[PDB]
Write a protein that binds this DNA or RNA. Structure first.
Lengths: 83, 54, 87, 87, 83, 55
DNA sequence: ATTGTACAAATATCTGTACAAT
DNA sequence: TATTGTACAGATATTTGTACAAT
């Protein structure tokens, strides 16, 4: 997480956009009035939100945790599917 | 999701920064060389990270 | 054309549900499975995403706006952790 | 600097819960209530939206990425249906 | 819901974008292989998504419906709040 | 959410219609004159309309 | 009814750079 | 220090109606 301030971000916005895409890193931009932001690539945002979608509901999170545990402990069902 | 191109985001960066904080909203900044970014409030980022890393 | 798929117990029940009450979901899930088998975990239809946190090692594709196919691939063998959102 | 506010039972439980466990939430909620009283149901901070379906007549503003303040204005009196997402 | 075919939508895209924004209408665009789309204004989309967000979870939908009925019948709690 | 400008969207309309159906996501196409639209699959629109009703 | 592809001139974006004033 | 609104200006990209060709 590279930290920068607003004035640097404003003056170097294209460089920050190119960095978070090429190096898949994130920038926190600081404000003096405590209105800070985080900047990330669209690819990282999409990836983050998709996991967030699955985890945000506690029951779906537990459903996923239990199902992955079942698969890793060999408690499974085989299906043959014509495709 | 607010959508603005790079030139607008630079000309109005501060407004966008207080916008995503006031609205708990996000901005996607487009670019002509396929280097888009997303801007969110730091407190929203910390909240989401906490949620997905239990 | 005929694939061998591992399901978690809970994903198996949900697939069975769809087989009874929602043939369109089953058709979509099967098209996603075909894409996974043909192109691998990260390529093809459904907007493949690589999952994070304790879901690391697994991937998700969109069945529709609401439901996700959460899966992994073990040496070309597909395992389904989920195919339906749980509330 | 002071507002008369009507809560639903469940919304008041969740407001008090936020008072005891999350002061940051109560501050943002009160900031939203101030903006509703000053600017009306649809203008101001929090991405105000007009709700549909059986929620027609009510509005929502974002407390944060996850939680919504669901409210209506009845004769300039703010009524709160919800201030915390229920899973 | 206006219904148009793919070729018309291609040849008249800007007019469709103008219409769904000015008239707050939507258009369904058909294709011969059945993968149709509907087009709406970005503001209509945000409005629908926010209601969908609150309705998507059955327990939150029930919570909201009960809270609104409570406010309707007057089973409420009224407090002064300093803001 | 895919984001494209109006000219790209028209240039590639059929590909975008296919993609939002195959991937069950959406396209915001941008305009210079504040007339942005969102394109989603019809099946997704119908699904979302159904869950909007309190059952 | 379909898709990819084309023309072309008005408008918009792009991007470093930097001046005041704080 | 770090802040914001503001501006220049050539170069490059977007805009939009129209429409050919082949399906």
């Amino acid at each position: 997480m590279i930290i920068k301030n607003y004035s640097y971000a404003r003056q170097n916005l294209k460089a920050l956009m190119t960095k978070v895409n090429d190096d898949s890193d994130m920038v926190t931009v600081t404000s003096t009035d405590d209105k800070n932001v985080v900047i990330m690539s669209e690819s990282d945002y999409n990836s983050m939100m998709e996991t967030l979608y699955l985890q945000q509901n506690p029951n779906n999170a537990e459903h996923l945790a239990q199902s992955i545990a079942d698969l890793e402990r060999g408690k499974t069902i085989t299906k043959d599917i014509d495709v | 999701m607010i959508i603005k191109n790079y030139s607008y985001a630079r000309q109005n960066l501060k407004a966008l920064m207080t916008k995503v904080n006031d609205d708990s909203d996000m901005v996607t900044v487009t670019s002509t060389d396929d280097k888009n970014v997303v801007i969110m409030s730091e407190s929203d980022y910390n909240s989401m990270m906490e949620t997905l890393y239990l | 054309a005929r694939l061998n798929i591992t399901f978690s117990p809970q994903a198996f029940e949900d697939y069975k549900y769809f087989q009874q009450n929602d043939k369109k979901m089953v058709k979509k899930i099967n098209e996603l499975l075909k894409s996974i088998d043909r192109n691998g975990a990260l390529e093809g239809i459904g907007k493949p995403e690589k999952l994070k946190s304790n879901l690391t090692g697994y991937y998700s594709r969109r069945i529709n706006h609401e439901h996700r196919l959460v899966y992994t691939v073990d040496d070309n063998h597909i395992k389904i952790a989920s195919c339906k959102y749980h509330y």
